[model samples]
Target chain A: GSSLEDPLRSFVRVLEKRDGTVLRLQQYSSVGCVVWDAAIVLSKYLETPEFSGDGAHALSRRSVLELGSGTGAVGLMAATLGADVVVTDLEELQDLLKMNINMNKHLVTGSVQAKVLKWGEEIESPPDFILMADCIYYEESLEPLLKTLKDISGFETCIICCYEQRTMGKNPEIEKKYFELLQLDFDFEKIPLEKHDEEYRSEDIHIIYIRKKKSKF
Target chain B: RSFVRVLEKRDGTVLRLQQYSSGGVGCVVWDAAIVLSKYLETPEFSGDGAHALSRRSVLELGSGTGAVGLMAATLGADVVVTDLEELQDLLKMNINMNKHLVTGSVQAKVLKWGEEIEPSPPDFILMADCIYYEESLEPLLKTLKDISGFETCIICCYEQRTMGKNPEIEKKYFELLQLDFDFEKIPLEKHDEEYRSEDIHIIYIRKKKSKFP
Candidate 1:
């Protein structure tokens, strides 16, 4: 049932686990259709000893919600690590996310489903964790993204955000504005590069742990 | 036209390597070099609890900018950074730049591949990003065979490039390499967490024992 056009439409990326489980994801040539390095870094960090190994299943049975889940890489990784995950993105990205979830469903010990979510929109409930990767590129969406974060995060929710620092035009300003606005409602700490996944880290890429600030009485 | 690449070790020792702006591939430090350099400090090769490479002799092939060899030297292994004549000056410059951090010793030499070389087998042989072309594949295998003895461990690191003729060259090099030596790939979990990649690989190789009865 395959044709020559099918191979050109998408390419496969293989992500391997330490236990020999391989996740095969299909990526298209179009924009925002492939997995980024920051996604790979954050995905692998979920499998580290701190999260999954040494009798510690920190993510097992936890509820996870991933924002702007372009290729669904990070959320799928959390699902594989036993987190019930809802991977959300724009309406255009749902098919790709569902395709990837189906491709690696066997590795998922928990549950994963894809849904349509736009920034600054309504959400069901506060999840145990919120995951975002490489989602802070544009200046126009920063406010909307923050709105979604504030709407979906409870005081007990932990937000894990990973992004690659860029020195190009508007990137620095965008990052500075993100942190400036973020500090008003959320508290965060940068995860040191040494603490990241050993084989999948970079100097310019950063991971941060964020949480909503508590309200004063 | 020269820039510096600063690499900080696990213990916070920084090695500054000078690289050329555009001389050639040897003038710059590659990702394979960084991966291999940091791998030397892993628990398998360093630390007090491990059988360390301290006081051992190491030879680095195609030692562009001498990153891996300098790293071994800093870990207390006497090291020789060998490459073509064109890269000797860069190697020596990097050694001189970072010599204060060296716990053992480091020197630079010109060792052309496939040439009639001396018979001094080092305790460890290091190579990084040297398998780019097909013309040098056979010669590199010959050099590896010439210098590696039964006890000498060879640590080879290269990036797995899928572009153009790279896959073919890598295939041919390993096929010929296994004829005279036994090798195993170091798992990604064992690599230095910050400096490793899925495409870059570190391999441990040893000369096979003779089958004569």
Candidate 2:
């Protein structure tokens, strides 16, 4: 018999909002346990003038679902920007998400909760906006991921996908396949590099907006 | 209390820069430094043709940890990493630590702004995150004016902060700088593909040639 224990080494990453509110996220030493660059980019993008400003109010009082929410960085950022958010991942990652949500609860202007969501599984309801960061990595999970996106997205839902454009082996092919499958049921547009957050954007990491196509009947 | 930040070059050379926990801001690497360092490796500066930095003279101002100048040196530019006298030890240590990877030459020196010294203009002058502090604004500009020749192409990178007094400092610095120099921002698309930021900017500056006189 073996007993499991939490990682002993952890570090804190301090992400400051536009208004100077900081999100202190705890990251573990284990693999996939820390905040990735695309997550930081996407999180900062949510706070840009388009979403966080008073005139836009795009995320205010809206419902947001974050798929594969490692460390819950983007969804927590959405919560701080006044969106009711559910940050989902596998069962093992649920504890990390819950811990992060609890640590930063005071800054939430709207609401945030943690849940377990496996791709290709049943989802309760569609959200107004869906956010995904660095989720297009694995080759085998490509089909299931697309199935989940197709199953949960409604015509009105908007999906914001942020990923690092890696040129390494298998990465370019995986990205190609994901988009080829994605465009069948959804239409997507790349958000221009200038539209990203001033301090956090990069050339390799891209942000795109995807929406389900309406039935032509 | 010392920590290391490892930055990898495009060709996979790693720069392990050391930082102190108790030292001031110069002890650690800033975002602008990383941005400019990566930009120096772009096709314009790292190419094999006329635009390359190989065999060119480069001077880095306010060389905290000498990250930017070191990158230029590794890219085949003869570089001088200069800062206040107090920062000489850190700068020299970094130069020595990464000496093996240098394709061109690099050395550390003490060059305080607005101070009188030997005048040896370089082909390119690099500055990163040096736009802060109201007291040093004029001094920094004076140093730039004194050291830069007509052929010197100065590359400056700075983060545009909107905090109290920061915006005013930035505005005043640019206003005074533009009077004697002509500059154009390096567009975001031209920056290094992976290491660019919207708030951080890179600009190429040269002395305004005399029209009459």
> Which model scores highest in lDDT?
1
Which regions of candidate 2 are displaced past 4 Å? A1-10, A29-32, B1-213
DockQ scores for all the models shown? Answer: 0.01, 0.02
Estimate the TM-score of every prediction.
Answer: 0.50, 0.50
Candidate 1 residue B147 C-alpha distance from true site, Å: 33
Report residue B145 deviation for candidate 1 (angstroms). Answer: 33
Q: What shift in Å separates residue B75 of candidate 1 from its native position after superposition?
A: 48
Query: Model 2: per-residue lDDT, tens digit, A1-217?
Result: 1011221211445688889988967654223366778888999898888656667468989999999998899999999988999999999888778878888999999899999889988777679999999999997458888888889888889899999898999888898999999888889999999999887888888999999987687
Question: What local lDDT does model 2 show for residue B153?
Answer: 95
Q: B68-129, model 2: which lDDT tens digit per residue?
A: 99999988889999998888888887888799999999999998876665766899999999
Mind giving the per-residue lDDT tens digits that candidate 1 earns over B54-76? 88999999998899999989988
User: Candidate 2, residue B31: CA error in Å?
Assistant: 41
Instruction: Tell me the TM-score that candidate 1 gets on chain A alone.
Output: 0.93
Clashing pairs in 2: A198-B199
